[PDB]
Design a protein around this ligand. Sequence first.
Ligand SMILES: COc1ncc(C2=CCOCC2)cc1S(=O)(=O)Nc1ccnc(C)c1
Length: 863
Amino acid sequence: DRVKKLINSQISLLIGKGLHEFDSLRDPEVNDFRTKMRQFCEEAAAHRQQLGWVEWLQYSFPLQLEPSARGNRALLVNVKFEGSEESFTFQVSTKDMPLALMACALRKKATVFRQPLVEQPEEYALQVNGRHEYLYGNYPLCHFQYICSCLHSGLTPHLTMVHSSSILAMRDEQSNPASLWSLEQPFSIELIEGRKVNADERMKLVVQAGLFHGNEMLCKTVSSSEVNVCSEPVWKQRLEFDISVCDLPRMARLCFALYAVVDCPIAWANLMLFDYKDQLKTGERCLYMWPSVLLNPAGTVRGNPNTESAAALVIYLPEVAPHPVYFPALEKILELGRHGERGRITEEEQLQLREILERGELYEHEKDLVWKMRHEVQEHFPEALARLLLVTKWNKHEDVAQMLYLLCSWPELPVLSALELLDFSFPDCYVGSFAIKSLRKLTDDELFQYLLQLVQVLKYESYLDCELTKFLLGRALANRKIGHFLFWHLRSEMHVPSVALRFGLIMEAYCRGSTHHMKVLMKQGEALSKLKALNDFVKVSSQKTTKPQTKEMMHMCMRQETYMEALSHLQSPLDPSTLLEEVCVEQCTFMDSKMKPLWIMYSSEEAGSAGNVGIIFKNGDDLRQDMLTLQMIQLMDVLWKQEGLDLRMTPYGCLPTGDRTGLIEVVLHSDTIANIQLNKSNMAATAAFNKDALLNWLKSKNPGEALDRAIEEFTLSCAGYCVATYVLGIGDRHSDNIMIRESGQLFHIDFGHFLGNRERVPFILTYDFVHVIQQGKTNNSEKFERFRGYCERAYTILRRHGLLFLHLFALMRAAGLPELSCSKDIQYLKDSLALGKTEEEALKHFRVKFNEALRESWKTKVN
Ligand SMILES: COc1ncc(C2=CCOCC2)cc1S(=O)(=O)Nc1ccnc(C)c1
């Protein structure tokens, strides 16, 4: 009671919505979700409380491995022991396991402390200094993301030997405190009246209505009669749909659209015909409609929360029986579908099936053949499940029972196929459950890669308690990195009234499961409060006083006790492994752009060089599209690295955290092309020609022999971003949104416009980069053509995984991004990846675009 009331107020602050509002609804669906999901999450917290010390490391500090390891050389390593400032530098091989390194550290400890030790290497974990990152398991050193980054950057790994008893003390510290088919009457509803309708009084009001099973219409859309415009329109009329009440599928939704005629659209509404407990809905309903900016089937089945102004359509769902009618059980359904005649198929008719299954829209007579051959499909082409599901007649219960009988015997599908089955175009709760079963095999690394999309799938759900929510909640409770990000993906959409109820409930369920992680997340949101307040002080001050004056005004504001306490010693929302220890106030600043984004610098004494990190607080712009583009780029880099192609990419973090608010990870020792190209006086890189400025900057940052590898880092990262921006249609590319690292790595920032946005983005080649690739020479086709090979290679690797990109982009349509909503945007990708052509055909096409970019590049060399 004493702690439960505090935990409840902590949860409420964390999610920015009071838990009392959930109870004020008096909603049974909400209440049952809160009881059931708190049971599931506390069970998980208890399971975690007893975990072994190595399993607790797997929960808190999951391994960050290189993509090639997933599923030789000398190396200097510095190792200290927890509780001592003394350290030991020693040489190891890139192929040695952490155990060998730990055993070597223990021998070099026994020889200094003159004592034959009791502790063994098996009792220790290697922590990365000043990070929530560990090195454990049977993997060679080079296979870890930390050691791998240290070899490229030439840096020395600094590890700490943490004992098993210390790891177990962290676990203890973070403890949680103690029958339908008989009804053959046509489906009908009574459109009674409307409220708060704001429309043109010269026009008349109409109510269109469709019956949907996801994207497909169950029957033709019906329309209401015209009634003069006013705040309270009255109809009191019965609308009949060409479908039997027995034929209505389980996941069927009634979609409404209120509009004016002489074509101004006013509002929309949806609802499920079956409630969460499978009962057919009866009685009067008040539908608080959403404003339209015609019928919207993919829209939310929950009403508009603002009842103080939303227009409300009043409907009556008739009583089709004297008793409540529930949806038949799986046992009753499987028996109907179990009986299903099998006919013999011709060998000439079997050639037509194998061709269209491997070929993708179908013709009317081909669907007839796909359905007839459903049994041969299940047993020889099980990967064609989604084609068959689309040919099934969801408005004819005999077909649906027959399909579900095959589904329950269907072999498990590869992850790529399951991702397709999560699309709104497959709304059956059993299809969704078969897809989740096939996704259970996803590794925590694959899960995390597609986590963003899986969160958008939750918006397509028809009911609060679903298999996907339980799967995502179960994975978040067993891996703290997944839990961290799943929290921030939901927390960032709390300002959207259509998703606030579901996301606030899922966040509450997680907080029951991890009380310690709630405190860690609160500390992060508290920092975000102070950052918003400090960015507001800057947004105002910057437009009166000069940039250097506003900087010391910001620095004094940051030096207040409330700021110094809130902004220090927290986990980075961008990376849970990165600890943000001491704010370096004098190092902080802000951009002179419209939204004045804050650049907050941090340092750590325990972490050293790796502890010096930056975060950019952005308020005013929507960070969702950058986050998606960056994840897509990082996916391309994982795909390329899996084929042994490392193109030296820079997928920095970017996380939306609230309404037009979010963080971006600063990439240090990097500058924009525009700033290097300023060609300033008295500095190192000043050149005779501007085409040299960038190569002279690389020359000053990488002296002598370092330059040759800096040019190769540039070439590889160039080839990678040329392909990525081409495939993704990233336009609006200029010198101020292209940055380069002191290492030679080139990268892109400011991903506001992608997928052509409506024009087709060509392949781009800047001659300023071509000059760096050619090592400052006018003609160097040896180096230039290596670059063209790196490009062709990168492009062909991505095409082999084009379906993965298409399925992921299809799931992202749920997010509501203005430049990603319909098939028109997904078309840009099929064109850029040339997915309908053969490899030699698509490479030939790609070669033409690269040559066309080269002709465009010579138009600036000749000048
Ligand atoms: C879209 O906005 C951003 N995107 C990325 C960065 C980064 C920078 C350096 O490290 C990797 C991240 C920063 C921002 S920003 O600071 O909000 N905007 C900028 C616009 C143009 N030029 C600059 C230097 C910044």
